Amino acid sequence: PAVGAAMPSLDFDTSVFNKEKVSLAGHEEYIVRGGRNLFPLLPEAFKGIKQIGVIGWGSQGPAQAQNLRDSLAEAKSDIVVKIGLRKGSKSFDEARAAGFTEESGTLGDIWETVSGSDLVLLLISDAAQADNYEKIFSHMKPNSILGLSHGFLLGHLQSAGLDFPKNISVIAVCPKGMGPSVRRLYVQGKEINGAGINSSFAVHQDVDGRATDVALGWSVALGSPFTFATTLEQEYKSDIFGERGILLGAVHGIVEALFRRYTEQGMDEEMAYKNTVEGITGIISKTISKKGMLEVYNSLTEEGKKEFNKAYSASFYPCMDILYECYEDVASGSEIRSVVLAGRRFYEKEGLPAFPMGNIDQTRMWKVGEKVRSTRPENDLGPLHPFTAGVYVALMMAQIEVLRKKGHSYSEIINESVIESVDSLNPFMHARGVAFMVDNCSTTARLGSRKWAPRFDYILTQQAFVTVDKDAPINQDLISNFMSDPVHGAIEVCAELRPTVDISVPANADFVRPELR
Template identity: 60%
Template sequence: MLTFETSVFEREYITLADGREAIVRGGRHLFDRLPSAFEGVNQIAVIGWGPQGSAQAQNLRDSLAGKLKVVVGLRAGSGSREAARAAGFTEENGTLGEMFEVIAASDLVLLLISDAAQVELHEQIFAALRPGATLGLSHGFLLGFLDQQGARFPENIDVIAVCPKGMGASVRALYLQGAQTNGAGINASFAIEQDVSGRATERALGWSIGLGAPYTFQTTLRSEYLSDLTGERAILLGGVHGIVESLYRRFREQGLDETEAYRHSVDCVTGPISRTVSKEGLLGLYRRFDGEERTAFRRAYAAAYPVGLELVHEIYDEVASGNEIRSVILAGERLKRFGMGTIDGSPMWKAGEVARGTRDDEKLVLDPGTAGIFCGVMMAQIDTFFEKGHPYSEIANESVIEATDSLNPYMHARGVAFMVDNCSTTARLGSRKWAPRFDYLLTQVAYPALEDPRADLDLGLLTAFEEHPVHEVLRVCAQMRPSVDIFVE
């Protein structure tokens, strides 16, 4: 069991299924403790102004309220400079500067540029860090790359991670909502890779609480990147995209018009399914159905789960082997020539523009077959992570909470591109690469099995589902859920 010590915040233990985990609950009442958590830090650098960089810089600045300087560092000629200035970070007030100059002048450096840029510039970044500084990451991608190269972080620095379980837009949006509802925010994991100063844990917890995390749980940097890279390629982004694309076509083939097919696929997943799972868990969703609807859920689940399990295992293997990290780096080079393609040009997303214009959220259909397919793939990811030994909090957040509370609301509001393309470049690439695989296998394997009365669907999978320990994990996590839902403009 992972555990940690803190003298600044209150550590508590929660029981998740058959295990105990140490966590720290957040809240604005703790902001006054942040200077103590950051003892020995005179300046915090936020390097980059992407989805996470912009959100984290603003949240930390607002939480610290002038008690500690937060400075944004950007590469010379960065196109993000004007956006940072518009948010109040300027050269005139000393809160905006050139990337390497800011790194050299800071005690805590939060490296939030793209993963590909981290790989390209890591040697220069390491050279610019002052001895005894703390390097902060929000993703373990760089560790995965260093492992491949047989390289290490500099030995004279702390290396910590705070990884919000949601896109940057959610990190900022829920933080702002927290001004009215204390505790509203995005959960985060933290990891300590190197602790030279003896202050690494306090700084990581202070960083997480300063971002507005309702609760912070512990993991390792390696476990984080394995689960995060896999999750965003599976149920969080790529998987859900492939699911709804395949379902939409299936409903059209069954005779539904464009709007109704969208209602039964996308709107169903991002609306009533996500809302129910967020507050009542997967078992709560299952219990919404009885009679023929329960049978439809069970058959759909039994058809989708094996497909999802095989594919999530493949993704995990690609991440663990380093293949997916290499793929992202190679794609980063291709992007310089080809750019990022669109993902919302299919007929479904055109139909969605019309459907969203006439949508009544209170009357959206809860389709049992759609629910079974979605839950089957989600549980396949959960079981993959259980098998690989990830901690319960990480499994619940990377497989369920992030999907329902942070990501799916964006697809509900404006479609898949609004969800995926508010995420990191690594996530965007992974979603584009793997969504077609989910679409293909569901269409080629799961749906034919559903339609074939002679198909031997393993309904015994539902017994394992009903008895699964993740339901108790989600029940405990739901008790720490903020009382507000994210508001997406």
């Protein structure tokens, strides 16, 4: 028991920024539109703060620190952005090459930074947080603010039965895109008004009433086109699930399964990759980003529309099966535990060898991807396969329904299932294959994709593809519900808030992780 879980739509109190109402399929929701002209409001937002500590130099570390180092800066404030790192760090400089040095008091030891900062940004590995939270909480300045970019720590603390220290404020600003994509559109927002990465914010513990505006100020400083409200609880349940879903894991498994099906049917290797990877990360991603899922179906031939329906009707439920399972593993705290233990396994213990993450793009189809891209003209969008579209859109709609029935706001659903996929991540796979997309994300996302991609491949091959081959009658209710689904109109409302510049991802990108350049 029982059946049904409505949408919680949280209302925040801001005194600095302009709270804006948004109607998403009849649901009231509140956001704050960012901009380079909102920067003079940052001193008002960051009162009581004298130093901001950026702990870590991974993916979000480099982007958030530099974005906060600017804007501040453009607001001429006294507050200092200081980087905290472990003694003898490999990503230490790096930070000096970016600008942060010992001489100017913008770079130093981790625990010197934590102790001397009013706002602490814990931008380190999620698993590292879980194994070192006590160590960090102890150094924290009394009556200060801890900022997170993910609710992973709360999920961990709840499993252990504990909570954050009650003497400190707990906030979160979570960019709904990868680290490199945060810095990359800013940059492209220094010239044009908008451009950035959509973010959610959470206020877990408010110690003195300053929390909301600090989180909002931090989000605007990053360049977030729109900042929507959520909780740490809702964030980690949707984000950890999201990366394992359509964002990385599911699209990978779907792509592997469809490629294998087409090659078994006689289609040559090179066209098979184009009909799967290039199509999804080409026209499909672009058509959804600007017109939505319904327009993907409409552009197809009458022969194609039937093919789309055959795929959707057969793929929707098998996709839901795994997504349903995955979410519940995250919500119960099983998956957070799994990530923590996997992080420990990266090193030798208990007489067993160390197991770092391996390469996921050395197999058959990704070498075909090398050959395809080597003679591919620039600005290529790929072919639109009707059957491929059906599967991918079914996967998208399955993810939406799961989160919908699990009581998430539409902004969270649309960002986690539609926006981040088609805007942020997919171009990276179009640029250089699956690994360039997955391994540029967080270690939690990377471990997540590797674990759950195989589950979608298997479910598609065992169930969805078998349904198509049995030539079972098309589910008329599924197709009818897809066409009339409230999300399609809700995505149109969201697409208005989208930064009106496409993300430019070159092959030899310098803004990516300093080991994939």
